Amino acid sequence: KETAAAKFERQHMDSSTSASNYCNLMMCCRNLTKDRCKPVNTFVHESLADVQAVCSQKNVACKNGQTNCYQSYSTMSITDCRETGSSKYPNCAYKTTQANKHIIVACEGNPYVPVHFDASV
Amino acid sequence: KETAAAKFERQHMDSSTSAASSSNYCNLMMCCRNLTKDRCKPVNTFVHESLADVQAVCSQKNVACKNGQTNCYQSYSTMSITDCRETGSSKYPNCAYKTTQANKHIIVACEGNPYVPVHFDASV
């Protein structure tokens, strides 16, 4: 029969860091492991329209000193992908981390849309 | 090679679908954890910390349990949880839940040898 301990675990436990293979597959399918392992990459899960809108949100400095960067007013759902210590092209391997943070993107063009992911904050 | 806008989409955009949104987490979890088999459990919380961190609560802040027993304990700090509560149109056997994420202190009842959590009492 189920122990009281195991019943508490089934009813109430869902560990987030235990909860992924998402980064390994996505870094592969978006071609970010093609000729080298991209070291770090962030994926944003909000709608394309909500991300494009960031270009008219808070104007901030880009890491490189340019001033065409914009920070989202609200935090957004993202997943950070970071190589593991053992990752080694052509066998790239990533640690997957979900977060809700402000994103900062560089915008340019007509339409004025995102062209570079600068940081999450 | 693509335009710089297209390259940003390829490198950084993975918009969630309606089906993969966290709004559906409880509907999935209440079913996969067998909490809707005999009836719709009205309220149930999931804790997203490690089992080790939840087990450690048994040696943190002793507090009265809702039912009057005294083997309850509150975590010293908030924890990442999800509250699952039936919506108004939930009707067994088609249970429906409202998914609510939060960072809140939790209170569990502990018992046994080893002394571990056996019941989730409340989030505060």
Question: CA distances (Å), B114 to each of B34, B53, B106, B117, in order?
Answer: 25, 15, 20, 10
Residues of A numbered 29-88 whose beta carbons fall under 8 angstroms of chain B's beta carbons: which are they?
30-32, 41-48, 51, 77, 79
Main-chain phi, psi angles of A24, to 5 degrees: -60, -40
Look at the alpha carbons of B86, B121, A97, A49 in this order and tell me if their dihedral is positive or negative.
Answer: positive
Question: CA distances (Å), A66 to each of A61, B1, B11, B12, in order?
Answer: 6, 24, 21, 20
Cα(B24)–Cα(A87) distance, integer angstroms: 34
Say if residue B91 is exposed, middle or buried (CB neighbours under 10 Å; 0-12, 13-18, 19+).
exposed
User: Before B117, cis peptide (omega within 30)?
Assistant: no
The pair of structure tokens assigned to A84 is 């593991």
Give residues with Cβ within 8 angstroms of A29, minimum separation 6. Answer: none
Q: By what method was this entry solved?
A: X-ray
Main-chain phi, psi angles of A116, to 5 degrees: -155, 135
Q: Does domain B1-124 have CATH number 2.60.120.10?
A: no
Cα(A40)–Cα(B59) distance, integer angstroms: 39
CATH architecture of A1-121: Roll (3.10)
- Tracing tokens 């993202």 back to the chain, one arrives at A78
Q: Where are the domains of chain A?
A: 1-121
The pair of structure tokens assigned to A93 is 């391997």
Residues of chain A contacting residue B8, judged by C-beta atoms under 8 Å apart: 105, 113-117
Cα(B100)–Cα(B104) distance, integer angstroms: 11
Q: Does A10 touch chain B (CB under 8 A)?
A: yes
Query: Do A79 and A96 contact (CB within 8 A), yes or no?
Result: yes
User: Before B42, cis peptide (omega within 30)?
Assistant: no
